Amino acid sequence: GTSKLKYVLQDARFFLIKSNNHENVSLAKAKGVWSTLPVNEKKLNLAFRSARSVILIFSVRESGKFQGFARLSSESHHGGSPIHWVLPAGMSAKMLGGVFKIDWICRRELPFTKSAHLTNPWNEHKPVKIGRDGQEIELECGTQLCLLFPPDESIDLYQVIHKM
């Protein structure tokens, strides 16, 4: 192991990402990309310039779990190959912001039952599973949450460390 993970998480910022379907998290895991609505895009871009690591912690709505976490490797950008997200009903791709490149740190899941002792001061000290898409997670809560995930032995944090 956990030592390189702790190094990556040192003074990181953390954001809760809520997806309405597994297809979008699967696409993000395969392609190393994420896109969000402009209100969250602006916050993530500010954070990316502001901290050594910005960590996105993903949860599919109604799943009762987190599906993993990843680190921003870029600010948002436009003009690339279109990602075929499964968009919510009535949503258009034009409504989205740009695309963030992300490096996955853990692709394993964590059930909410394992994070019940962690509350987020920035969301009224509600359990950290609770929050709108884009809710920032306070440093200590987010660090402890990420350390709860099962180790993902497929990932080598050496290359992510060099991006810091």
Tell me the C-alpha distance between 80 and 27, whole Å: 15
Per domain, the residue ranges of the chain are: 1-164
Number of residues written out for the chain: 164
> Was 120 annotated as part of a binding site?
no
Domain 1-164 sits in CATH at: 3.10.590.10
Distance (Å, whole) CA 13 – CA 53 = 6
Give which of 44, 22, 21 is closest to 98, Cα–Cα.
Answer: 44
Q: Known binder of ligand: residue 104?
A: no
Rounded CA-CA distance 4/86 in Å is 34
| DSSP codes of every residue in 101-162 | EEEEEE-S-EEGGGSTT-EEGGGTTEETT---TT-EE-HHHHHHHHHHSPP-TT--THHHHH
> What is the 8-class DSSP label of residue 100?
E
Resolution in A: 1.4
Output DSSP code: residue 93: G
Amino acid in position 42: K
Rounded CA separation 49/8 (Å) = 16
User: Per the annotation, does 34 bind a ligand?
Assistant: yes
Q: Tell me the two tokens of residue 7.
A: 């190094």
Experimental determination technique: X-ray
Token pair for 51: 């901290």
